[PDB]
Design a protein around this nucleic acid. Structure first.
Ligand code: MG
Lengths: 195, 94, 534, 234, 110, 51, 48, 47, 210, 49, 30, 195
RNA sequence: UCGA
C-alpha cells in the first residue's frame, strides 16, 4: 500500500511494468505526452479500478499515470492472483473499456462548450468533487480541462469565462462551482458514463 | 353452484334468456372497460393475488352479480342498437 | 418357473460345469467338457412397446452349476420365477373417498424404496436427404440459436450420450434449404432496420415432444459412402437417438392383480397418514372392499390371508389350480403366524392395548369373536379370520372394526398417465378438410363427434357448438381472427363458413349437382367470396 | 444426494468388471447411513477406490473427519479381475423425502442425482396400557418405541420431535427497507448504487460518509438526488 | 406416388392422408405475428417525422404495394436523389438507435 | 347477405362450362423432373390458379 | 395374421405366440361372426 | 416461515381460529390433540 | 367409376392392390363420409384429454386440472397475461419462452391462476349417451398429469377409475362461457332429464358410511 | 426362503414346450435340417412338387 | 335454432338505468 | 463458431450480453450510434481479439459490433472459462486497451490529412488490406474513414482527392490504393499501433 | 390388435 500526493506520478512511460496497481482512494489520470508538447488525458481511473495493465501483457508501461488528488493505491503481483482476483480484473478492465470508449465518444461529440459542460458534470461524480454553502464544486484547472476536452488552455478559459458571465458556473483558485446543474445538463446533452 | 342461480332463473321466463342477458352485458362491460358498471365500490367482485385483493377480471361474474342487484333493465326492443351503442360511447368512451 | 424357462428371456447353463467369469455385460462358463463358453448379456435394450429388456447375472465367479441351472435372470423375473409386479402390504378398507369406484391409494414408502419403478426407452429418428433446393445437413450450426440451446450437441450436431433432455431440447440438429419466396414489405423494412441478411437455411432440427424426455443412453449415425451401410434413394444420412427414463409410480398410473381387480392410483399419502399395525408397520396399498362383492372375485381375499401368513412366517406358497390350499390349512398357517405376531410382543414385556380392548368389544358386538375369552384369544380368533387391529395414522385412534390386511401381488400395467396426457391450443391441420389432425403423435386435437354435438344441442348451448364447428376447426379466417383477438385481449369475432362445407359444395359440383346458398330473397350468396366464379 | 462414477455417463450405464449395474449400485447407496459428528456440517463428499476380485463394503470408503459410517457391513458392488470402481458420493443433511428430480444436485457433469431419503427414523410405534394411581383407575401409561438407523439416537429424535411440537404450539400466540431500483431515483443512481453491491435504502443508510462518497460513480450530482430521496421518505 | 386413401390399421376407420399436415396455409400464429409486426412497425415509424416516414413507406412498399425508387420519391417530394437517400439513411439510423434502446422489434426477427 | 336457404338442383352442361376456368386436355399431373404442374393437365396453374 | 410383437414382458410374447384368431384372410369378418362361433363349445375342454 | 394465526369470534359462545400455512401433515397433528383436550380437560361446572 | 365406383360391376382398383378406388360417392356418404366425419362432427382446437382420478376434496362444481394441460389449453390467454405483467416484452417473446419447458419460471403459473379465474372448462367421456356426458366444471390447478373428477357426477358419466379417460374443452367467447356456467354447470344439473329423479346423489362409500 | 406347496394331484407329464405350436410348424414347413433326398412331401417341398 | 340460438330469447337487450335514462332524454328532446 | 457478412452486426447496443466473442478471421468494428444519426468508430477488433466484453461485467451490450469484412467469430460462455482462458482474455484486453488509447491519441494528433494518412497506413496492417499489380490496397469506404478520423465524409473525400492529385493514392469502388508509402508516412508523422 |  502507498499514498500519493496530487500531481505525483505512480509510474512513467517506458519504465518496467513489474507492478500492477489498484486505486483504493482518490482519482488518477492516464495520460500521454505528444510531440508538440500537448498533454492529453487518455482515461480516468476511479477508486477500485485496476491500472498499470501493461504489467499483465508487456514488459514496460506505455503511458503515464498521474494522481489528480491525494491518492491511496495498492500494488499487486500479477503472477500471484487467484481465480477470484482474475475475475475481478476481467470485470474491471471491461468496465474501464466501456468507460474509455464512452470518453472517446465524448471527445468527438458537440462543440467545446458542450464538451466542457459534460466534463464538468462528469467530474462532479468523481472524488474530485465536494460541496459547501455556495454549492457543489470540483477542484480542477483549466489546463486539465483542456487535456480532457481535446482543446487548449486559452479557449477553455474563454468558454468558462462565458459560463461565468452567464451565471452557470463560478471559478477561483483551480476551483469551479456549478451553479446551474440543469443548464449544464442541457448544454452537455448526453451524459458521460461515470460508472 | 353459481350464487343466486335460482333467483336468476326466477327473473326470466327462459334460462337461455338469462344466458343471453349475462353474455351481452359481459360484452358491454368488456367493451367499455367496466366503467359503466352499476355496482358500488364495496360491491365490486374481488380476486386474491399474491399482492392482494384486485378487481375480478371475469366479466361474466360481474354481469351476473349486477343482474342480481336489480339495477339492470333487460327485454326486447327497448332501444335501437345504434342509438344505444352511441349513447354508451358518449357516456363511457373507449 | 416354466413360463420364464420357455420364454427364452432368461439364461440357463447348458451342461454341468463351473462359472469362470461374472460381469454386468457377460458370463463365462467352463463346462465338464472343458470348453469355455461365453454368454453375452442383453443390457437395457428397447422392446417394441418401449419397455426395457435386460438380463442380470444371478451367479458368482467360481460357482458350481448343474445342467439347466439358472445363470442370468431375464426381464420381469426373480431367481427364475416370473415377476410381473411386487408384493405389497395391503389393507382392505375405504379411505376418505380416495378409494371411490375402484380407485387405489398407495404409500410414499413405495416410491422411497423404488417399488413399481420402471425403465422405458423411446426411439427418435431423423433423416437428412438430398433436395432439389440443396442437401439437408445434420450439423451443430443452427441459425438464430443461442449457445444455451446448442450446449449438449457435439461437433456433428448430435446430442451427447448421458445428457438430460427435456421438452423443447434439440436431439439432432438439422438445416434445410429454405424454399424460394418473396419477402413482405414489412420484412424488407425490418431487414433494412436491423441490417442483417436473411439466412439461406432453416432450422429443421428434431426436438423433444411435449411430455417426454429423459437421459440419452445411445446414439447411432449412418451416413452415405461409408462401409456396410446403404439408405433408401435420396437419403444422405439417418441418425437415431435412444432416450431412456426412470418412471416412478405416480398419480394416474394403473395397477391390477391376477384376479381381475384393477384401479388407478388417485392419492399418494405420506407415511404418517397411512393406517398402521399396532407394532408401527404401515400398509402399502389401500383397496376398497366395495369392489369385491359385485365382481365376485374372492381369490384376492384368500391371497391376502395366505399373504399375511406368509408375511409373518417369512415364506412363500404354491397353490395349484383347482387343487390348492383350502381354508383349514390357511387357518393353521394364520395361527403359526399369530404366534410370531403376538408372542413376540408378550415376550417383549407388553400387554394388550386399550384401543385393542375397545376394538375387541366392538368385535364381539359384531359376533366375530366369542364373548368371555381372553383378549389374546379373541385377537387370535380375529387373526384366523384374516383380520387385524388397525390404527388410523392421522388420529392415532384405531378403526372401529377389525380389518383384513395381508400380502398381495399387484402389477403395474403399461397404461401410464405420462404417455396419455395431451393438450393442444393450435397446431397442424388436415390437407383437404382443414380440420385439426388426430393423435398425440401429430399434436392433434380431440374429435368432437356426432354424439357430443347432440349433447351440446341438448344443452341449448348454441355459441359453444358454433365455436366447435367453426373457430376451433376449419374456419380459417375465423380461427386466425380468434387467435389474434385472444392474444390482443379482444373478444372473439363472429365466425365464418366452415371450409368443409365449401369442400362439400365443390365435391357435389364434381357430381354435377348445383348447390346454391340463398338469402331470404332467394338471391345467391357467395360463400367463395369472389374467388370461384369468373 | 449425488453419485459420480468414473467413466460412467449415466444411471443406465454398465460398468465393466462389476456385476451390479449402476442402478443397483445407487440402490445400495440409498441404504447407506452416514453420521455427521459436527452439527455445523451440512454436506460431505465420500471417495471410494477399489479393484480386483473383492466385494466392496462401506468400510472401503476413505475415512473423513467427523463422519461415521454406522453400517460398514453394507454391500455396494462385487468386483472382478480387472474391475475398477472409483466413485465420489455427495451426502447432504436435510429433512423428509426429496426425489432426484426435485433437488437436481450435480457436483460435476457426469454426476448422477440420487433420491434422497433424509429421515433417520425407520419406525415409530406407541402403546397405551391401563394403570392406576391408588384411588383413580383407568389411567393411562404411555410407551413410545422408536427404531432408527443409528445416525440419530431415539432419545435425540424424540427430543427434536417434542421441540417441534412445542414450537408449533407457540404459533397460537398472536390472534388476528425498499429496493433502490424501485425508488424512482436517477438512472445513474440506479445503475451505480445497484452494481456497487447494494440494492436498498437500508444499505444506502449503512453507507457512511467515508463509504457513499468513496464509490467511484458517486460524487455530488448523485448526493443531490440521494438527499432528495432522504427528503421524500425521511 | 402413394394413395392418400391408403388404410391405416385393420379397421376401415382411418386413412393415411389424415395424418399429413398442411404446410401451405399459414397458421393463426403466423397471421397474428405479421399483424403485430405491422403494428409495431407503425408504432416505431411514429417516432420519425412525417416526410421521412412517408419516404420509408414509399421505398419499402408499405404504401401502394410497389417499391418506389430514390428518383421517384425524390420527384414526389421534388428533391434531389442524394438528399432523399441521405434522409433515408439518417431515418434508418435513428430507427437502429431507437431499436437498440427499446428492444421492441428484436423478437420479430425470429 | 345472410344465408337462409340452401338449394340443390341438376346442373346443365352450360352451367358446368360456366363453372369451368378451362378444359383439362391432358392426363398429365406434374412434371417428373421440375415437379411443377404440367400445362393443360390436372394440376395446371393456368386453369385452377397459382400455387 | 402378421402382427407387431407384444413384448412388454416375456409372458406377453409367450401368450401372443399361442393365440388363435378366427379373423384374417380366408376367415370370418366381424359382422359374419354370430353367437355360434364366439360361443364356448363343449369340445373346447382341454383345447381352447 | 412463521404461520399466521387469525381469530374470528361471535360473542362468547362461538369462535373460529385459522392457522396457515403449515407443513404437510401438521394440520391434523395439531388439530387432533387440541380437539381431545378441549372436550375433556377444560375446567368447568355442572349440576 | 369416377362418380360412383363399385356401384355397377367390379370396382376398379390400382395395380397390385385389391383396394377399391375411392370415388366421390364414397367421399360423400358413410361413417367416414364427409357428412358424418367432417360436417356433423369435427376435430377441434383448445382441447385435451387425460386419465381421471377421484377428487373427494373437490366441490361439486369443481374439477382438478393439470397445470401443464391448462398452460396449453389457455395458451393465448396466458400469452396476453404475460404481456400485461412484465414477464415478457410482448406475445412473441412469451411464446418463445413457453416453447422450451426449462425456460418456464414460477410467475407464469401465478399468471395462469389469474387467467382461469372464474372461467370453466368442459369435461367429456365416451360414450356420450345423454347431455350429462358433457359437463362444466370450475378448474382448480393441481400438480400431476391426472384430471380430478368429482365423485357425484360419476353416475351421469358412467365414469369409474379403472383407467377411464376424459376430454377437456375450453369455451372461448363470453357467450360460450355464459352458456357453460349457467346451462352446462354440474351443480345446476342435479336431476335426470329422463325420469325427473336425482342423478347426482350419494352412492357407494357415502351410502355405506351414512 | 421356505417354499410350501399344496395339492395332492400328481401330474404324470410336465407342460409341453409352449412355443412348439410355432417352432414345430415352421420346422416342418422349411425342412432345413432334413437332407433334400429324405424330405417328406410337405410345406415348401409340397409347393414345389 | 335452439337454446341461446332460439329466435325467442336471442334479440334480448340489456341496458343500465343511467344509459337508459340518457337515451330516454335524447329521444324526448327530438 | 459463426460467420458474418460485411455490414452485418454481431450484436446490438442494449441487447442481452449473454455471449462473449473472439474474432477468428476478418475485421470487426466497435461503434456507437448517436440520436442525431452520426456513426463513430470506437475501436478496431482484429483476429484474436475478444469483444462483447460487456458479457464479463454487465447484463447488456453498451456498443454495437459490425463486421467490416467476411468474418469468422467464436462464441464463448464467460462462466465456463479456466485459468488459461482468463489469462488470454486479460492479456488481450490489455492489448486492446493499449491500442484503443493509441487510437485515442491518433484521433487528436495532426490535421485531417495526417489522420487520414495514418488511418490508411493502419488499415494497411489489417485484414481489410490486400495486394495486386497496382500495389497494396485497402477495402474501405470514405464514410468509414470519416467515422474513424473524427470528421465527416465530405472533407475526407476532399483530402483524398488532393492526395489523388498529388499522386500519393488512388481510389475506386470503396477501394483505396497506397502508391507512396514514404509520403504517407511523412504526412502521418507518428504511426498508429496495429497490434 | 389394443384401452374405456
Ligand atoms: Mg372403467
Amino acid at each position: 500500500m502507498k499514498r500519493f500526493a496530487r500531481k505525483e506520478t505512480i509510474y512513467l512511460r517506458g519504465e518496467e511494468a513489474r507492478t500492477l496497481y489498484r486505486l483504493e482512494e482518490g482519482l488518477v489520470r492516464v495520460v500521454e505526452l505528444l510531440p508538440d508538447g500537448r498533454l492529453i488525458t487518455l482515461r480516468h481511473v476511479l477508486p477500485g479500478d485496476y491500472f498499470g495493465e501493461e504489467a499483465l501483457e508487456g514488459k514496460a508501461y506505455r503511458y503515464t499515470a498521474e494522481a489528480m488528488t491525494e491518492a491511496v493505491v495498492q500494488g499487486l503481483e500479477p503472477r500471484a492472483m487467484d481465480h477470484e482476483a482474475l475475475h475481478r480484473v476481467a470485470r474491471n478492465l471491461a468496465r474501464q473499456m466501456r468507460r474509455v470508449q464512452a470518453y472517446e465518444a465524448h471527445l468527438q461529440t458537440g462543440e467545446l462548450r458542450a464538451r466542457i459542460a459534460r466534463y464538468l458534470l462528469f467530474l462532479a461524480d468523481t472524488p474530485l468533487s465536494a460541496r459547501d454553502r455556495q454549492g457543489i464544486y470540483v477542484t480542477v484547472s483549466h489546463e486539465e480541462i483542456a487535456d480532457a476536452t481535446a482543446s487548449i488552455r486559452e479557449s477553455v478559459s474563454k468558454v468558462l469565462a462565458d459560463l461565468r458571465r452567464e451565471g452557470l458556473i463560478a471559478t477561483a483558485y483551480r476551483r469551479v462551482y456549478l451553479l446551474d446543474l440543469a443548464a449544464l445538463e442541457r448544454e452537455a446533452g448526453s451524459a458521460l458514463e461515470a460508472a | 353452484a353459481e350464487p343466486g342461480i335460482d333467483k336468476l332463473f326466477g327473473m326470466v321466463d327462459s334460462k337461455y334468456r338469462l344466458t343471453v342477458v349475462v353474455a351481452k352485458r359481459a360484452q358491454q362491460l368488456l367493451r367499455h372497460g367496466f366503467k359503466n358498471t352499476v355496482l358500488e365500490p364495496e360491491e365490486r367482485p374481488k380476486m386474491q393475488t399474491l399482492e392482494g385483493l384486485f378487481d375480478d377480471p371475469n366479466a361474466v361474474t360481474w354481469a351476473m352479480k349486477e343482474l342480481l342487484t336489480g339495477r339492470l333493465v333487460f327485454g326486447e326492443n327497448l332501444v335501437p342498437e345504434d342509438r344505444l351503442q352511441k349513447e354508451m360511447e358518449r357516456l363511457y368512451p373507449v | 418357473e416354466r413360463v420364464v424357462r420357455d420364454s427364452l428371456a432368461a439364461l440357463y447353463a447348458e451342461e454341468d460345469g463351473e462359472v469362470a467369469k461374472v460381469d454386468g455385460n457377460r458370463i463365462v462358463v467352463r463346462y465338464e467338457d472343458g470348453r469355455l463358453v461365453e454368454y453375452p448379456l442383453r443390457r437395457f435394450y428397447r422392446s417394441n412397446q418401449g419397455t426395457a429388456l435386460d438380463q442380470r447375472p444371478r451367479v458368482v465367479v467360481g460357482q458350481r452349476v448343474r445342467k439347466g441351472d439358472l445363470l442370468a435372470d431375464g426381464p420381469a423375473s426373480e431367481n427364475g420365477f416370473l415377476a410381473l409386479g411386487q408384493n405389497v402390504l395391503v389393507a382392505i378398507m375405504p379411505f376418505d373417498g380416495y378409494n371411490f369406484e375402484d380407485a387405489i391409494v398407495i404409500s410414499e414408502e413405495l416410491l422411497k424404496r423404488d417399488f413399481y419403478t420402471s425403465i422405458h426407452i423411446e426411439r427418435y429418428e431423423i433423416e437428412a436427404r438430398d433436395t432439389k433446393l440443396g442437401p439437408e445437413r445434420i450439423t451443430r450450426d443452427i441459425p438464430h440459436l443461442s449457445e444455451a440451446a446448442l450446449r449438449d450437441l457435439d461437433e456433428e450436431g448430435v446430442v451427447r450420450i448421458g445428457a438430460e433432455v427435456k421438452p423443447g431440447d434439440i436431439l439432432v440438429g438439422r438445416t434445410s434449404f429454405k424454399g424460394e419466396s418473396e419477402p413482405t414489405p414489412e420484412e424488407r423494412l425490418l431487414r433494412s432496420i436491423f441490417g442483417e441478411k436473411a439466412r439461406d437455411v432453416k432450422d429443421t432440427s428434431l426436438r423433444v415432444p411435449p411430455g417426454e424426455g429423459g437421459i440419452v443412453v445411445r446414439t447411432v449415425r449412418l451416413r452415405r459412402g461409408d462401409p456396410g451401410v446403404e439408405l433408401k434413394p435420396g437419403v444422405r444420412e439417418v441418425v437415431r437417438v435412444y432416450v431412456a427414463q426412470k418412471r416412478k409410480l405416480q398419480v394416474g398410473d394403473k395397477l391390477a392383480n391376477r384376479h381381475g381387480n384393477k384401479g388407478v392410483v388417485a392419492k399418494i399419502l405420506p407415511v404418517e397418514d397411512m393406517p398402521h399395525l399396532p407394532d408401527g408397520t404401515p400398509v402399502d396399498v389401500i383397496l376398497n372392499p366395495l369392489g369385491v362383492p359385485s365382481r365376485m372375485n374372492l381369490g384376492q381375499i384368500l391371497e391376502t390371508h395366505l399373504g399375511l401368513a406368509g408375511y409373518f412366517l417369512g415364506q412363500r406358497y404354491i397353490s395349484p389350480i383347482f387343487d390348492g390350499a383350502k381354508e383349514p390349512e390357511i387357518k393353521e398357517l394364520l395361527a403359526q403366524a399369530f404366534e410370531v405376531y403376538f408372542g413376540k410382543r408378550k415376550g417383549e414385556g407388553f400387554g394388550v392395548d386399550k384401543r385393542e380392548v375397545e376394538v375387541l368389544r366392538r368385535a364381539e358386538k359384531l359376533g366375530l369373536v366369542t364373548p368371555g375369552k381372553t383378549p389374546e384369544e379373541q385377537l387370535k380368533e380375529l387373526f384366523l379370520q384374516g383380520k387385524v387391529v388397525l390404527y388410523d395414522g392421522r388420529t392415532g385412534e384405531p378403526i372401529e372394526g377389525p380389518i383384513v390386511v395381508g400380502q398381495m401381488f399387484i402389477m403395474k400395467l403399461y397404461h401410464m398417465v405420462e404417455d396419455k396426457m395431451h393438450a393442444r391450443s393450435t397446431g397442424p391441420y388436415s390437407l383437404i378438410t382443414q380440420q385439426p389432425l388426430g393423435g398425440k403423435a401429430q399434436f392433434g386435437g380431440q374429435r368432437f363427434g356426432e354424439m357430443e354435438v347432440w349433447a351440446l344441442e341438448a344443452y341449448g348451448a348454441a355459441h359453444t357448438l358454433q365455436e366447435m364447428l367453426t373457430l376451433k376447426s376449419d374456419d380459417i379466417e375465423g380461427r386466425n381472427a380468434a387467435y389474434e383477438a385472444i392474444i390482443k385481449g379482444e373478444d372473439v369475432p363472429e365466425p365464418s363458413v366452415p371450409e368443409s362445407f365449401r369442400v362439400l359444395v365443390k365435391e357435389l359440383q364434381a357430381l354435377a349437382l348445383d348447390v346454391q346458398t340463398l338469402d331470404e330473397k332467394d338471391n345467391p350468396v357467395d360463400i367463395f367470396e369472389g374467388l370461384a366464379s369468373k | 444426494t449425488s453419485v459420480y462414477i468414473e467413466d460412467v455417463l449415466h444411471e443406465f450405464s454398465t460398468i465393466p468388471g462389476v456385476k451390479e449395474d449402476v442402478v443397483e449400485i445407487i440402490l445400495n447407496l440409498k441404504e447407506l447411513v452416514v453420521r455427521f459428528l459436527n452439527p455445523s456440517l451440512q454436506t460431505v463428499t465420500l471417495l471410494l477406490k477399489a479393484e480386483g476380485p473383492k466385494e466392496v463394503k462401506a468400510r472401503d470408503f476413505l475415512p473423513v473427519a467427523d463422519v461415521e459410517i454406522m453400517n460398514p457391513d453394507l454391500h455396494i458392488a462385487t468386483l472382478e479381475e480387472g474391475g475398477r470402481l472409483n466413485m465420489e458420493v455427495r451426502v447432504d443433511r436435510g429433512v423428509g423425502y426429496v426425489p432426484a428430480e426435485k433437488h437436481g444436485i450435480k457436483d460435476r457433469i457426469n454426476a448422477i442425482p440420487v433420491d434422497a431419503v433424509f429421515s433417520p427414523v425407520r419406525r415409530v410405534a406407541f402403546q397405551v396400557e391401563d394403570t392406576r394411581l391408588g384411588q383413580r383407575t383407568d389411567l393411562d401409561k404411555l410407551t413410545l418405541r422408536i427404531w432408527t438407523d443409528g445416525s440419530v439416537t431415539p432419545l435425540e429424535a424424540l427430543n427434536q420431535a417434542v421441540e417441534i411440537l412445542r414450537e408449533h404450539l407457540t404459533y397460537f400466540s398472536n390472534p388476528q427497507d425498499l429496493p433502490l431500483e424501485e425508488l424512482g431515483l436517477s438512472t445513474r443512481v440506479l445503475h451505480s448504487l445497484k452494481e456497487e453491491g447494494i440494492e436498498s435504502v437500508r444499505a444506502l443508510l449503512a453507507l457512511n460518509l467515508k463509504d457513499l462518497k468513496n464509490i467511484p460513480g458517486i460524487g455530488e450530482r448523485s448526493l443531490e438526488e440521494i438527499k432528495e430521496a432522504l427528503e421524500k421518505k425521511g | 406416388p402413394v394413395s392418400l386413401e391408403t388404410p391405416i390399421g385393420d379397421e376401415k376407420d382411418s386413412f393415411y392422408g389424415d395424418f399429413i399436415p398442411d404446410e401451405h396455409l399459414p397458421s393463426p400464429v403466423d397471421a397474428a405475428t405479421q399483424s403485430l409486426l405491422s403494428e409495431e412497425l407503425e408504432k416505431a415509424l411514429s417516432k420519425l417525422s412525417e416526410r421521412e416516414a412517408m419516404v420509408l413507406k414509399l421505398r419499402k412498399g408499405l404504401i401502394d404495394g410497389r417499391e418506389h425508387t430514390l428518383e421517384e420519391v425524390g420527384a414526389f417530394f421534388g428533391v434531389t436523389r442524394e438528399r432523399i437517400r441521405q434522409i433515408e439513411n439518417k431515418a434508418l439510423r435513428k430507427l437502429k438507435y431507437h431499436e437498440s434502446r427499446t428492444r421492441k422489434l428484436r423478437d420479430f426477427l425470429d | 347477405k345472410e344465408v337462409r336457404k340452401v338449394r340443390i338442383a341438376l346442373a346443365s352442361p352450360e352451367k358446368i362450362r360456366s363453372w369451368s376456368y378451362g378444359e383439362v386436355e391432358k392426363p398429365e399431373t406434374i412434371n417428373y423432373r421440375t415437379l411443377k404442374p404440367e400445362r393443360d393437365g390436372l394440376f395446371d396453374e393456368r386453369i385452377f390458379g397459382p400455387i | 395374421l402378421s402382427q407387431f410383437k407384444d413384448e412388454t414382458n416375456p409372458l406377453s410374447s409367450l401368450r401372443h405366440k399361442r393365440r388363435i384368431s378366427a379373423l384374417g384372410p380366408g376367415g370370418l369378418t366381424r359382422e359374419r361372426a354370430g353367437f355360434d362361433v364366439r360361443d364356448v363349445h363343449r369340445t373346447h375342454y382341454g383345447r381352447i | 416461515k412463521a404461520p399466521v394465526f387469525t381469530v374470528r369470534t361471535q360473542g362468547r359462545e362461538y369462535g373460529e381460529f385459522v392457522l396457515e400455512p403449515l407443513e404437510r401433515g401438521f394440520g391434523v397433528t395439531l388439530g387432533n390433540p387440541l380437539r381431545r383436550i378441549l372436550l375433556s380437560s377444560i375446567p368447568g361446572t355442572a349440576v | 367409376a369416377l362418380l360412383d365406383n363399385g356401384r355397377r360391376g367390379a370396382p376398379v382398383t390400382n395395380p397390385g392392390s385389391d383396394r377399391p378406388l375411392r370415388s366421390l360417392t364414397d367421399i360423400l356418404s358413410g361413417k367416414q363420409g364427409r357428412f358424418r366425419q367432417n360436417l356433423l362432427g369435427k376435430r377441434v382446437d383448445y382441447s385435451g384429454r387425460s386419465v381421471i382420478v377421484v377428487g373427494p376434496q373437490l366441490k361439486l362444481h369443481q374439477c382438478g386440472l393439470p397445470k401443464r394441460m391448462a398452460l396449453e389449453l389457455f395458451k393465448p390467454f396466458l400469452l396476453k397475461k404475460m404481456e400485461e405483467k412484465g414477464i415478457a416484452p410482448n406475445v412473441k417473446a412469451a411464446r418463445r419462452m413457453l416453447e422450451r419447458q426449462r425456460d418456464i419460471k414460477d410467475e407464469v403459473w401465478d399468471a395462469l391462476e389469474e387467467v382461469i379465474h372464474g372461467k370453466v372448462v368442459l369435461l367429456n367421456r365416451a360414450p356420450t349417451l345423454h347431455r350429462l356426458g358433457i359437463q362444466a366444471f370450475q378448474p382448480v390447478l393441481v400438480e400431476g398429469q391426472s384430471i380430478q373428477l368429482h365423485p357425484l357426477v360419476c353416475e351421469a358419466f358412467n365414469a369409474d377409475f379403472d383407467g377411464d379417460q376424459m376430454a377437456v374443452h375450453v369455451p372461448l367467447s363470453s357467450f360460450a362461457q355464459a352458456e357453460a356456467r349457467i346451462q352446462m354447470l354440474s351443480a345446476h344439473n342435479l336431476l335426470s332429464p329422463a325420469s325427473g329423479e336425482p342423478l347426482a346423489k350419494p352412492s357407494r362409500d357415502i351410502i355405506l358410511g351414512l | 426362503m421356505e417354499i410350501k406347496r399344496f395339492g395332492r394331484i400328481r401330474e404324470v407329464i410336465p407342460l409341453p414346450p409352449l412355443t412348439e405350436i410355432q417352432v414345430e410348424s415352421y420346422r416342418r414347413a422349411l425342412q432345413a435340417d432334413v437332407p433334400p433326398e429324405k424330405r417328406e412331401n410337405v410345406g415348401i417341398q409340397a409347393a414345389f412338387r | 335454432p335452439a337454446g341461446t340460438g332460439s329466435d325467442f330469447v336471442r334479440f334480448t337487450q340489456v341496458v343500465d338505468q343511467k344509459t337508459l335514462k340518457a337515451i330516454e332524454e335524447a329521444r324526448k328532446e327530438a
